[PDB]
Design a protein around this ligand. Structure first.
Ligand SMILES: [Zn+2]
Ligand SMILES: [Zn+2]
Lengths: 8, 144, 114, 49
């Protein structure tokens, strides 16, 4: 829910 | 025991006052988002003109997604950093993040500045409908 | 390239060579009809498959409400300003984000790619 | 505004959702038809130029 590399 | 009995004297709380930031910080966050959306638009227009050159080992779709995600992620992190600058010493979100008891810098950033990109299965939100994410958006919209 | 069906039996004609005359003949296996082949090409395979999608695009797609429309790119054939623009919309299109513009307005049906 | 005025006095006007559907103001759309429909989240904001 954050970014592509983070968390969903 | 000793610290918990001191906490009766000092006390701790979490309120909306912690989430709210200065007006200047909100303007800076908004400006970062504005220029990020413009950059994504420029990348899209380059891709439509076919001026974009494929990254080695990647298709043009993959490299377009890579560049767009990089721009959006940089904007997201920059807005988060501005929000974290805005935090005062008294801010309780900062108290908990700095002490390490709970939370993280990411949570403060999402609370104050920008929730961030939503990714499902490692990609941006897919085209569930025919060539569009939701019925409200126009077909073939790769924008932010 | 194209497949020719014999008149006598309405079945597919398969290539065959007459050794005596060294002439290519499209002859059905079921019936004895034989036809000389003008094309002289049996099998063509395009591995690159660089086939323009302009032919495949239908002029009817201009009527779609969901398609985006630009007045910035004028029509070449008739000069109508509006033009719906959409991507390849095709599997096995490799990696192309080209916009295949289609002129709006009734009966123009012009498809151009810039 | 005439439709919402009739609906507002829903009592003693016998104007209801069925009348709205019959008048052509509203329509039922399934997902397959949703794929062919351009929708506006909020009317005033998105419809206005
Ligand atoms: Zn035959
Ligand atoms: Zn035209």
């Amino acid at each position: 829910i954050w970014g592509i590399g983070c968390n969903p | 025991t000793v610290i918990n009995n001191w906490l009766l004297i000092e006390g701790h709380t979490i309120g909306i006052g912690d989430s709210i930031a200065d007006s200047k910080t909100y303007q800076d966050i908004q400006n970062t988002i504005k220029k990020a959306k413009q950059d994504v638009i420029e990348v899209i227009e380059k891709a439509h003109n076919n001026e974009l050159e494929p990254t080695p080992g990647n298709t043009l779709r993959q490299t377009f997604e890579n560049q767009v995600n990089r721009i959006l992620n940089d904007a997201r992190d920059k807005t988060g950093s501005s929000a974290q600058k805005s935090l005062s010493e008294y801010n309780n979100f900062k108290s908990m993040v700095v002490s390490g008891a709970k939370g993280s810098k990411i949570n403060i950033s999402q609370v104050i500045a920008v929730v961030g990109q939503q990714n499902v299965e490692g990609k941006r939100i897919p085209f569930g409908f025919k060539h569009r994410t939701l019925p409200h958006f126009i077909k073939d919209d790769y924008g932010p | 390239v194209g497949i020719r069906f014999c008149q006598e039996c309405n079945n597919m004609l398969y290539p065959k060579e007459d050794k005596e005359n060294r002439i290519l003949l499209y002859a059905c296996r079921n019936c004895d009809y034989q036809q000389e082949a003008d094309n002289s090409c049996i099998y063509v395979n395009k591995i690159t498959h660089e086939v323009d999608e302009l032919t495949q695009i239908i002029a009817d797609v201009s009527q779609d409400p969901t398609l985006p429309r630009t007045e910035d790119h004028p029509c070449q054939k008739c000069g109508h300003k509006e033009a719906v623009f959409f991507q390849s919309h095709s599997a096995r299109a490799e990696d192309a984000m080209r916009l295949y513009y289609v002129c709006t307005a009734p009966h123009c049906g012009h498809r151009w790619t810039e | 505004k005439r439709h919402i005025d009739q609906l507002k006095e829903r009592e003693y006007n016998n104007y209801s959702w069925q009348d709205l559907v019959a008048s052509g103001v509203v329509e039922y759309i399934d997902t397959l038809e949703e794929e062919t429909v351009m929708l506006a989240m909020t009317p005033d904001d998105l419809q206005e130029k």
